[PDB]
Every structure is written in structure tokens, then in C-alpha cells.
Design a protein around this ligand. Structure first.
Ligand SMILES: CCCCCCCCCCCCCCCCCC(=O)OC[C@H](COP(=O)(O)OCCN)OC(=O)CCCCCCCCCCCCCCCCC
Ligand SMILES: CCCCCCCCCCCCCCCCCC(=O)OC[C@H](COP(=O)(O)OCCN)OC(=O)CCCCCCCCCCCCCCCCC
Ligand SMILES: CCCCCCCCCCCCCCCCCC(=O)OC[C@H](COP(=O)(O)OCCN)OC(=O)CCCCCCCCCCCCCCCCC
Ligand SMILES: CCCCCCCCCCCCCCCCCC(=O)OC[C@H](COP(=O)(O)OCCN)OC(=O)CCCCCCCCCCCCCCCCC
Lengths: 240, 365, 354, 239
């Protein structure tokens, strides 16, 4: 049971202030959404948690271990995964090699352990039938499944998804939600940010609304959809 | 061990392509220079595909470090643009580990460059000089024009004949002004060897063989009353081709074995220069990994021209320091290693910029 | 269509000016670094800096077409990557109208190029070269590499430096007799052109009677010289054929034709200086074709890299085909027409392919 | 007027992308162009626009046949276009933004151009930002100015490319309001977008294109009840 806590985050680009005292918390086995208007500090907060943006104030700690000053690989070794929005598969490496290139860097696995881990990751995500196709010849669903398996190959405690339901067909969101539920069942604290409010609020069991660089709401779908301030600044009065 | 031979294949392929393009461009430029010189009339058009063939090793040894620089830049920029390294870093890969992965192709490139520098460019330059001098494709004295003067270096030697004939004999007059650049104040070294007949001959044993049929030699400088008249026949004077000697010296053709035990400062400076071209490979490898971090807004190609300018400045500074070395001014103890260390320190500053910023921010809070 | 024309013209003009400034700065820096090799006591740092800064207009005029090509690429790609040309095309503006809008500033740019290359570049280039020669050439009878040699009936003259206003420095005359004996060898500091008169002030001749006697050095204060060297012709021979004005090139080509020498080196310079507008037009046409084709979505760095590479290839081909016309047998006109011809052909092809 | 695309086809390298897709956009009609990402929907949209050369078929705007005309010829024939990305003239003011396209029109004189510019500024509620540079505009103001500039060329049909792309649920109301205002003028809007719900809401007729073929057409209710669509594109759990 882990806990990724972001406390009093603040960031100021140019001379203006984008984020101002946003506090978050994601447990283990919990799905959390980070929603808000485009111009607000939603993406900035997400990246400050990820490690791509250095927070000016505030701390980011996982299990009483400051990772706010560590670089991206330091956070990754601390147990914080990350999956980029666009396609990020090794184009010229086969599907098995995509996962093995990450399994080979694990210091707690031997050759037999790596073999069994690769077999388990291939069978579990139903990508065993394409275990030899190059990553450049994969469709969207297979590419996403291989990317998720590759991310899991490094054994993270938290996975931070960046726009999973981006430019996907209505049938394709079912696969993404199945994968996210599988990750939650495994015991990983997924955190999602996305433009697609409906499916994000459907899959997430807790949501954070960030407007004007502040946290203006928090709670499940019912509490978010019944908030006058959120309905005024973000969702309008005619949302669902 | 998979990412290792993935990055090492991408970098090597891109380096090969870039090096081929750069070699084509450099050879084309040298060809325009030599073609203009042949147009002036001081070269044989037939002996042009060996002059360029024996100069390829030097161009390759000067190009391969730049090929590796640009190949690393392009390959790692492609990997950064395609979100392919953000997922290597988000799983545990450091930046020192990336440097260690990058230093494997650099070793092969450095071995190739060291071989070219120490055993194949001297031989090519030796053969090029042997051709251009011994085989005397056509000497400048075989291109004389009646009524028009011909000069060399800083006008130190001006040859002219009044009459030009197919037989190349009994020329009306040979106005040659062989002037010493420095011969002390009293004697200026300027001498005129004018003859009634031009004794152009086989010109085989001592390259251009020239003798005066009758002989009228004066060493008297016009400024003073001191006149040195030698009305006897002038002895044979041996004329080398200025083009071969101007660009290629003896230091560029001596074997590497002769530089280790030598004491002549030129030879020691040349040895220090030879054991430097492998070193730019590692220096630019360290300089290239931090520089290849790009955004989709910047792209791969933004910082290619600045990299070329930086490499050219590196080479120019090395050449200037070698000149100041073999001229006896800069002591041989320090050599070009201080230039190498300066660029290494620039690379280290580029590499440790982000860790330094992160450590500074951590202590501030 | 006034506001769109002004918008495109201003963008392209500013981009071309910036690229030309950067290219000229790099060229001047490289020239100064190269010139540092021949530093000396008589030729100081200030003299080298003055020469480099005085040969600025020549370099700018020479490198104008490359600046036009790269600036057109950058400026038009700025609009193309912002989807501001798709709007023009979707409003009813054809591709030919956009090409004409880009071409309108090019006319004034190439007119300015012709004017400078005919009136300003030769003047400053002559001033600069003369200065370097005067500095690097006052030592003695045979000191400078920038000197001139001439032959009279029996006299042989070596002029260390040739200055614009009919004045020479270091005039040395060797007057051999019939028996090839040195009847008189002289050196003069200066000279002045007065119709048929050349006044060799500060002349120290050393004549020698070969009847077994010593040479008598005589310090004449002023001597008349019956030289057949016209200063107007003297300034032309000491200057590179590409550093002369178009009119001066025409006059010298005809003068060479009258006597019977080979003027094929000067015809190349005449064609290069005259047909420059066509070359710039072809280059900007191909740049426009590039923007509307392969490079309508790439970043700025790729456009700059492509422009630089294409300019390098174009200049390499142009400099390869110059001496090739003289060593081989084909007119120098084809050494200027061909590269721009294929550039225009490729541009028209890529524009037709849309 | 009536825009017809008939028997459209387009084959890329080796493979075939679009095979016999036929549509028809009337005047005062809002029509959608939906389908899976891989299928030939964007290709059909661009072939109607004029950005992709159709291998077969004919595009006829009313009586005229404009299948061979280039993009500017089609635009002169009365086909507008609004790109997905920001396409505002950055260095030109809003009034200059509209005027640079109003000057193109040949049927207007100086007084007519001035009156048209004033009417366009007052009608889209941008008369108070008429002196701001195009690069200093927010998303809503930029989109309103872009639509005003598109109208400045007097088109018959406007082909919007992804209007509801990465916008808040607040702004879709404004986008729908602008689209309905355009429809009330007599313009045959055509929308292609990823947002299935919003497109099926605002539109009046939809065209589903999968595997390069038209698999369904009709209003939203008939599209949502189609079994084939519910099995290839929407899914059985879509509303
Ligand atoms: C005859 C003359 C020589 C040949 C002329 C050039 C022919 C080949 C050039 C192809 C350029 C293609 C290009 O711009 O794309 C970059 C290429 C592919 O990238 P792309 O697929 O476009 O990615 C998006 O990406 C690559 O892999 C590029 C590899 C090609 C070599 C890059 C250029 C290196 C040389 C630059 C010289 C610039 C001037 C330097 C002069 C000083 C030298 C010391
Ligand atoms: C965003 C893009 C980033 C790109 C970054 C690129 C960085 C490149 C940095 C490397 C620059 C290398 C410059 C090489 C200079 C070579 C100078 C040289 O050869 O000088 C030798 C000259 C000869 O004099 P000497 O032999 O002493 O003769 C005495 C006369 N009896 O000795 C002298 O007399 C020289 C006296 C000094 C004169 C000044 C030198 C000017 C050089 C300026 C270079 C600046 C480059 C940009 C920074
Ligand atoms: C004896 C003569 C000696 C000559 C020595 C000349 C040395 C010049 C070397 C330094 C020049 C560096 C300039 C590089 C600037 C690049 C920076 C940049 O991005 O500039 C963009 C700038 C923006 O312009 P802005 O006013 O914003 O335009 C919009 C207004 N509607 O755009 C600009 O407008 C700024 C850039 C202007 C550059 C002007 C310089 C090039 C033109 C002169 C060519 C040389 C010709 C000399 C003789 C001419 C005789 C007629
Ligand atoms: C000797 C070679 C010299 C080469 C110099 C360097 C050239 C670099 C060219 C970079 C620009 C092309 C980049 C191509 C990227 C991949 C192709 C692509 O994505 O573009 C699509 C395009 C088809 O679209 P469309 O333009 O309609 O045809 O596909 C295409 O049709 C691409 C067409 C590319 C055409 C390049 C033409 C280069 C012309 C060089 C002229 C040199 C003149 C001087 C030498 C004279 C010698 C006599």
C-alpha cells in the first residue's frame, strides 16, 4: 500500500502564475482523474507530478521519500511510471524485444526470471499472437497493449496516463477501460488527465478539477456533476 | 543489452550517410580548386583523378568526427521526437548510461580515425607528392607564352622568354629573376640569368632541368653600386613545381615511426597533431549527447549548422596552436592538450547543466 | 488584393534581409580569420580589418542570390506552417498570384543588386585592394606579391603597387644592352601620369659601363619616363575580372578581342554579372515550389538546412562549370544558364504537381 | 444550390482507400461525415475540399462541374474551408484580417467593401476587438474572427474540419450557435469530427464511411439504431 502525495505545488511561467497551491493524493489500487479547463493548471500539475516540469514551491513524495528534486529516471526507479500520449513504441524492435529491453534492466530478476516475466506479460495482455511483429506494423489497440505491457515490465507502483482516450473510436475506449481496470486489479494507482470528460469521469472513482491554477472541486462523478462552481466555469449548465 | 545495439545501429547508419555526403561535398570543392588551377594552365588535366584519389584519406580523417557528431545529433533527435526516449528514461535509463551506450560506436570511429591518421594519410600524401613532383605531368616551363611574364610565390622568381617555339630551343632570351627572400642587407639575392639561347632540355633527372646556353648572370642589387657580374655560362638550376610543395610539406609525409624519437619541433608538433584526431571523436561524442535533446517545435535540424561551426572552430584552433607550437613560441610541454581540455570542459558544462540546476534548486528549498 | 500583397512582400523582404545579414557576417568573419595568416609588421591588424570591412559590398552582391533563396524559404514557410496560405487559396487566390506577390519585392531587390554591383562594389573593391598593396608593398624593388611586371623594348619594369590616381610605387627598371649586359638598373619610389610624362621621383639608378669599370650609383632627384603604360589599363589588369563593373568588363572584353588574346575568362564574368536576375528568379521560384510541396509542414530548422544544402550544391556546380568552360570547348554562357535552367525546370515541375 | 460528390474513389500506393462514396450537401443543411479513423473519411472530406486529387468520380456544385478545378477554382465556385488548426493572420489586425479577404471579391466596390466589413464586424460581435493583432486573441475570439473571414469571401458551402477538437464543454455551445447562425443564412455546412455525440447532435444528416464505403446515412436516430454501425464504429454500449 503506497501513496503518491503532491503538496502545495506552485509554478509560475514568465512573470505570471500558472499553478497556485494545488494538493493531490493518489493511493494504491485507486483510479484518479485530473480534469479542468484547457488554460488552467491541469497539464502543468500533471507534468510536475510526472517530472517533466520542475515545481517552484511544493513537494512530491511517494511513501515518505521526496522525489520532487529527482530527475525522471530517479522517479522511475522510485516507482512512478509514465505513458506518453502519442505513439511511443520502439518502431524497429519486435513486440517481444519491446518488453525484453525493459526486463533486462531489472536487478531483481535472473535469466529464468526474465523469461518467465516475459511469458507472463505476453499471455496476460493477449499479445502473444504478435510476439514477433515489429512495433511499426501494429494497429492502435495492439500498440497500446504493447506499450502498457512494456510500462509494466519495469514494475511500477503508479502509472500516470496522458490522454488515453485521445482520438480513439467509441469501440476502442472499451479496450482502454479494460486495461485500466486490469491495472487497478493488479494494484497500481493510475492517474489520468484527458480532454474527454465523459469517459474519464466514468472510469475514474475520484476526480480533481483545476481551474485558474487552484483546486476547485474533488469527489466522485456525482459530486463533480452536482457542483455549481464546476458547472459554471467548466461544464456549463447543460452537461448530461 | 538490446537498447545498446539499437542505439549503436541507428548512430552508425546515420553517421555513414552523413559522412558520405560530407566527403562528396569536400571532394567537389577541392576539385573546383584544382580545375581552376588547371584552367590557369599550371596542371595536367589527365593527372586529376589520382590527385583526388590520394587525398581521400585526409578528407576522411577530418570528416569522420563530424559525421559522428551529426549522426548522433540526427539519430537521438529522431528518438526524442518520436517519444521513444521519454519511455526509456521513464523506466530507469540514466543519462550517464546513455553516454556509456554512445561511447561504443565512438570507439570504432576513433579506431578508424586513428588508423587513417597514423598509417594511411601519410602514405597517401607521400604518393601524391611523389606523383606531382617526380612524374612531372607538365612543368610550368612547358606552358610559357611569348611576351607574357610568369611568377611564383611572392614574385620571388619570374620567368619569361621572348620567343616560344615548338622545338623549345634557341629561345631569344631567358629573363629569369631568381630572388632570395632574405639574403641580408648588403646582398638582396636578386639575380638575372639571361641567355641568347634558351636551353630547354629533357628535364628528367632533376625534375625541371634548366641551363643557360651562353650565360649572363648578375647578382648586383640595383639599389647600391655593388655589382656582381658573372658573364660565364650559368650552371644547371633545378626547378620544382610550386603547387606540389606549397600545399604538401615533408611533415605531412614522414612516417609515424620517425616522429617518436625526433627532436625537430616540427616533427614533435606533427606527432601531437596526429594523436589528436582520435581525441576529437570522444570530445564530440561527449559534446553531442546533451545537445541532442529536442522538442517537436525545435526538431532535429535546428542545431546542425551551429554544430558544424563549432567543429570548424575546434579544428581551426587546433591548427593555429600547432603552428604556434612548431614555430617555437608555445612550449611543447603543454601542446594542444589545453585546447582539447577546453572543449572537453565545454562538453562537461553542457552535460552536467541539468543535474547542477536540480541540485541547486534542491538546496535552495 | 493590396493587404495580402503587402503582407507577403514584407514577410519575405524581412526574412531575406535577416538571412543576408547573417550570411555576410559569417563570410566576413571567415575572411578575416583567413587573412590573419599573412599578418606582418607593415600589414597590421587595423589594415586587415579595414580591408575586410571595405570588401563588404562585393561579398554582399556575390551572396545575394543565396540570401534570396534562403530568405524566401524561411519567410514563406512561416506563412505555410501557420496555415495562412491555405486560407488564401481557399478564398480564391491562385498559386500564380502568390508567386507574383512573392516576386514583386524580388524585382526591387535584384534592381538594387544590379545597381550596387555596377556602381558601389567596384569602387570599394578597388579602394580596398589598392590599400592592401600599398601597405604590403613599399619595401624594395621586389617585395610584394601584388606587384606588376612589364616589358619595354629592352627595359623590364616591376611596379610594386598600382594605385588608382595614376601613381605607382617601387618602379624598378632593368635596361639591358644588346650584349645583354646590365647598362642601367634603377629603382624609383613613386611615379605620376602626365600624358606622355611619368615622373620617377626619388630615383637611384646604378648604371654600369662594361668596359672594365665600377658601377656608378647616381642619385637623380627627378627623372622623366617614356612609359607606354596607361593608368586606366593598369587598374584593369591588377584587378580580378569578377571585381570589375559591367561596363568596364564590356570595354576590356572588346579591347582583348581587338588585339587577339583570349577573353573567355572575362565573358564568364560578364555573363555572371548580367544574368544574375534570372538566377535569383529561378532560385526563388524553386524555393516557392519547395514551400508548396515537400516543406509545407516541416519546422524552421529543416527549411534552413535544405536552403543551405541547396545553395552549397548550386555554388559548387557553378564553380565547377566555370573553369570547365575554359579547359573544354563550349561557350561560357552555358556555364551560367544550365544550373538556373534546371532549377527553374524543377521548380515548375514541383509547382505543377501542387 | 446543391453540392454533389458521386462515385468518388482514391487509391494510395498499392492499396485502395476510398471506393464509390457518394454524398449530397444541400443549402441550409448541416451534414456530418463520420467513421472509423483508418477508413476513408478524411480522404473523402479532402477530395470534396480540393486538397486531394480524386482518381474517379465527379464533384458538381449545382449545375457546374468542378471535379477538375484546383482548390482556388473550387473556392471561386463557392466552396469554403476552415482548417482545424489556428489559421488567423498573426501580424494583421482583425479588421485587416477581414478586409484582406474582402478586397479579393471582385463584385464589391470601395463603399460596398466598407459596408460589408462593418456588417461582418457587428454581426459576429467582434467590433470591440477590431484593433487587436491576430496573434493576441483567445480561442473563442480567434474562432469567431476565422468564421467571419471565411464568410467574407461569400461562399455557398463551408466545410468545417474538426470544430469540436480539444475544446471545453462550455465552448461547444458557442460553436453550435455559430454553426446554426451560418445555417440560418443559407449555407450548406459539412462537419467531419471525432466527437460523435456533438456531431450527431448538431447535424441533420450523417454519412458513416467505413472501409472506403458508405455503410449508413440518415438522421441521428436512424444512425444510432443501425446494427452495422453499432458493430463496426459505435459499439453496443454507445448510448
Ligand atoms: C551531390 C552533392 C551531395 C549530395 C546532396 C544531398 C543529397 C542527400 C540529402 C538528403 C536530404 C534529405 C532531408 O532533408 O531529410 C533529412 C534526412 C531524412 O529525413 P526526413 O525523412 O525528411 O525526416 C522528416 O535525414 C538524414 O538521414 C540526412 C542524411 C543526409 C546527410 C545530411 C547532410 C550532411 C551534410 C551537410 C552539409 C552542409 C554544409 C556543410 C559544409 C561544411 C563542411 C565541413
Ligand atoms: C550559435 C553558434 C555557436 C558557434 C560557436 C563557435 C565557436 C568557435 C570558437 C573557436 C574559434 C577559432 C578561431 C581561430 C583563430 C585563429 C587565429 C590565428 O590563426 O591567429 C594567428 C595569427 C598569426 O600571427 P603570428 O604568426 O603571431 O604573426 C606575427 C607576425 N610577425 O596570430 C595573431 O596575430 C592573432 C591575434 C588575435 C586576433 C584576433 C582573433 C580573432 C578570432 C575570433 C574568433 C571568434 C569566433 C566566435 C566566438
Ligand atoms: C562598409 C559596409 C560594411 C557592412 C557590414 C555589415 C555587417 C552586418 C553583420 C551584422 C548583421 C546581423 C543581423 C542579423 C539579425 C537577425 C535577427 C533577427 O531575427 O532579425 C529580425 C529582424 C526583425 O525585423 P522587424 O523590424 O521586426 O520587421 C518587422 C517590421 N515590419 O529583421 C531585421 O530587419 C533585422 C536584420 C537586418 C539586417 C541588415 C543587414 C544586412 C543588409 C546589408 C547587406 C550588406 C550591404 C552593404 C553595402 C550596401 C550598399 C548599398
Ligand atoms: C544533386 C542533388 C542536389 C540535392 C540538394 C539537396 C536537396 C534536398 C531536397 C530536400 C527537399 C525534399 C525533401 C523530400 C522529403 C520526402 C519527400 C516528401 O515528403 O515530399 C513530397 C514530395 C511530393 O509532393 P510535390 O512537391 O507535390 O511533388 O516529394 C517530392 O517530390 C520531393 C522532391 C524533392 C526535389 C528536390 C530537388 C532538388 C533540386 C536541387 C537543384 C540543385 C541545382 C544546382 C546543381 C545544378 C547541377 C547542374
Amino acid at each position: 500500500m503506497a501513496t503518491l502525495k503532491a503538496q502545495h505545488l506552485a509554478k509560475s511561467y514568465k512573470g505570471r502564475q500558472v499553478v497556485r497551491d494545488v494538493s493531490m493524493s493518489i493511493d494504491s489500487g485507486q483510479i484518479v482523474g485530473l480534469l479542468g479547463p484547457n488554460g488552467a493548471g491541469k497539464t502543468t500539475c500533471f507534468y510536475m507530478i510526472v517530472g517533466l516540469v520542475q515545481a517552484d514551491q511544493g513537494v512530491v513524495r511517494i511513501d515518505e521519500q521526496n522525489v520532487t528534486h529527482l530527475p525522471m529516471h530517479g522517479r522511475a526507479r522510485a516507482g512512478i511510471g509514465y505513458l506518453p500520449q502519442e505513439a511511443s513504441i520502439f518502431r524497429k524492435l519486435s513486440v517481444s524485444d519491446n518488453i525484453m529491453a525493459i526486463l533486462e534492466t531489472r536487478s531483481d530478476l535472473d535469466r529464468n526470471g526474465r523469461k518467465e516475466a516475459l511469458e507472463g506479460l505476453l499471455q496476460e495482455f493477449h499479445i502473444h499472437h504478435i510476439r514477433d511483429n515489429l512495433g511499426m506494423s501494429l494497429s492502435g489497440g495492439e500498440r497500446r497493449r504493447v506499450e502498457i505491457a512494456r510500462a509494466l515490465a519495469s514494475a511500477p507502483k503508479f502509472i500516470l496516463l496522458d490522454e488515453p482516450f485521445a482520438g480513439v473510436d467509441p469501440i476502442s475506449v472499451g479496450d482502454i477501460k479494460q486495461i485500466i481496470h486490469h491495472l487497478k486489479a493488479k494494484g497500481i494507482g493510475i492517474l489520468i488527465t484527458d480532454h474527454n470528460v465523459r469517459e474519464t469521469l466514468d472510469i475514474c472513482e475520484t476526480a480533481y478539477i483545476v481551474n485558474d491554477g487552484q483546486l476547485i472541486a474533488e469527489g466522485d462523478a456525482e459530486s463533480i456533476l452536482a457542483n455549481d462552481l464546476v458547472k459554471e466555469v467548466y461544464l456549463g449548465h447543460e452537461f448530461r | 543489452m538490446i537498447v545498446f545495439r539499437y542505439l549503436s545501429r541507428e548512430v552508425l547508419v546515420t553517421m555513414s550517410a552523413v559522412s558520405a555526403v560530407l566527403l562528396v561535398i569536400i571532394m567537389s570543392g577541392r576539385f573546383i580548386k584544382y580545375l581552376a588551377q588547371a584552367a590557369q594552365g599550371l596542371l595536367d588535366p589527365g593527372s586529376l583523378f589520382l590527385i583526388m584519389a590520394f587525398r581521400i584519406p585526409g578528407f576522411l580523417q577530418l570528416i569522420l568526427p563530424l559525421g559522428l557528431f551529426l549522426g548522433i545529433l540526427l539519430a537521438y533527435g529522431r528518438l526524442y521526437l518520436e517519444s521513444e526516449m521519454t519511455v526509456l528514461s521513464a523506466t530507469g535509463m540514466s543519462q550517464k548510461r546513455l553516454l556509456g551506450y554512445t561511447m561504443a560506436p565512438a570507439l570504432l570511429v576513433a579506431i578508424l580515425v586513428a588508423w587513417l591518421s597514423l598509417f594511411l594519410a601519410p602514405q597517401g600524401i607521400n604518393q601524391f607528392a611523389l606523383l606531382l613532383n617526380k612524374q612531372d605531368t607538365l612543368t610550368e616551363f612547358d606552358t610559357l607564352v611569348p611576351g607574357r611574364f610568369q611568377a611564383m610565390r611572392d614574385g620571388t622568381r619570374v620567368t619569361y622568354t621572348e620567343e616560344l617555339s615548338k622545338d623549345r630551343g634557341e629561345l631569344a632570351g631567358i629573363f629569369i629573376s631568381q630572388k632570395d627572400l632574405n639574403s641580408s642587407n648588403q646582398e638582396r639575392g636578386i639575380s638575372i640569368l639571361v641567355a641568347e639561347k634558351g636551353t630547354q632540355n629533357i628535364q628528367a633527372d632533376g625534375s625541371r632541368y634548366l641551363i643557360l646556353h651562353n650565360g649572363y648572370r648578375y647578382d648586383g642589387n640595383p639599389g647600391q653600386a655593388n655589382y656582381r657580374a658573372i658573364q660565364y655560362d650559368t650552371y644547371g638550376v633545378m626547378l620544382p613545381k610550386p603547387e606540389a610543395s606549397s600545399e604538401v610539406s615533408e611533415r605531412d609525409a614522414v612516417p609515424t615511426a620517425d616522429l617518436f624519437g625526433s627532436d625537430n619541433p616540427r616533427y614533435q608538433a606533427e606527432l601531437q597533431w596526429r594523436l589528436s584526431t582520435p581525441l576529437l571523436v570522444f570530445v564530440v561524442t561527449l559534446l553531442a549527447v546533451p545537445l541532442s535533446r529536442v522538442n517537436p517545435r525545435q526538431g532535429r535540424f535546428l542545431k546542425l549548422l551551429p554544430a558544424i561551426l563549432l567543429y570548424m572552430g575546434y579544428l581551426a584552433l587546433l591548427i593555429a596552436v600547432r603552428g604556434q607550437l612548431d614555430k617555437g613560441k608555445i612550449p611543447m610541454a603543454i601542446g594542444l592538450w589545453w585546447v582539447h581540455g577546453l572543449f572537453l570542459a565545454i562538453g562537461l558544462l553542457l552535460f552536467y547543466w541539468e543535474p547542477l540546476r536540480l541540485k541547486l534548486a534542491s538546496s535552495r528549498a | 488584393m493590396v493587404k495580402l500583397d503587402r503582407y507577403i512582400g514584407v514577410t519575405v523582404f524581412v526574412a531575406i534581409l535577416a538571412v543576408l545579414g547573417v550570411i555576410l557576417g559569417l563570410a566576413l568573419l571567415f575572411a578575416f580569420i583567413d587573412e590573419l595568416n599573412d599578418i606582418s609588421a607593415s600589414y597590421g591588424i587595423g589594415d586587415a580589418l579595414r580591408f575586410i570591412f571595405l570588401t563588404a559590398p562585393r561579398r554582399a552582391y556575390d551572396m545575394l542570390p543565396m540570401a534570396a533563396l534562403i530568405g524566401c524559404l524561411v519567410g514563406l514557410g512561416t506563412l505555410a506552417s501557420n496555415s495562412e496560405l491555405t486560407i488564401m487559396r481557399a478564398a480564391g487566390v491562385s498559386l500564380s498570384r502568390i508567386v507574383w506577390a512573392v516576386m514583386k519585392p524580388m524585382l526591387v531587390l535584384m534592381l538594387a543588386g544590379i545597381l550596387v554591383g555596377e556602381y558601389v562594389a567596384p569602387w570599394t573593391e578597388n579602394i580596398a585592394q589598392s590599400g592592401r598593396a600599398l601597405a604590403q608593398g613599399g619595401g624594395d624593388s621586389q617585395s610584394s606579391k601584388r606587384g606588376l611586371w612589364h616589358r619595354q623594348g629592352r627595359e623590364y619594369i616591376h611596379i610594386n603597387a598600382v594605385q588608382p590616381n595614376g601613381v605607382l610605387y617601387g618602379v624598378t627598371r632593368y635596361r639591358f644592352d644588346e650584349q645583354r649586359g646590365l647598362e642601367s638598373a634603377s629603382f624609383a619610389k613613386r611615379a605620376r601620369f602626365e600624358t606622355d610624362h611619368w615622373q620617377l621621383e626619388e630615383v637611384t639608378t646604378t648604371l654600369l659601363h662594361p668596359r672594365e669599370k665600377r658601377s656608378e650609383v647616381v642619385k637623380l632627384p627627378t627623372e622623366r619616363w617614356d612609359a607606354q603604360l596607361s593608368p586606366q589599363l593598369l587598374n584593369t589588369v591588377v584587378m580580378e575580372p569578377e571585381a570589375l563593373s559591367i561596363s568596364g568588363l564590356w570595354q576590356y572584353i572588346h579591347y582583348l578581342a581587338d588585339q587577339g588574346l583570349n577573353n573567355n575568362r572575362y565573358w564568364l564574368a560578364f555573363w555572371t554579372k548580367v544574368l544574375q536576375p534570372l538566377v535569383t528568379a529561378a532560385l526563388v521560384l524553386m524555393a516557392i515550389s519547395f514551400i508548396f510541396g515537400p516543406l509545407r509542414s516541416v519546422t524552421l530548422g529543416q527549411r534552413i538546412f535544405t536552403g543551405v544544402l541547396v545553395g552549397f550544391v548550386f555554388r559548387i556546380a557553378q564553380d565547377l562549370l566555370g573553369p570547365s568552360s575554359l579547359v573544354f570547348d563550349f561557350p561560357p554562357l552555358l556555364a551560367v544558364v544550365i544550373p538556373a535552367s534546371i532549377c527553374a525546370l524543377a521548380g515548375v515541375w514541383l509547382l505543377r504537381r501542387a
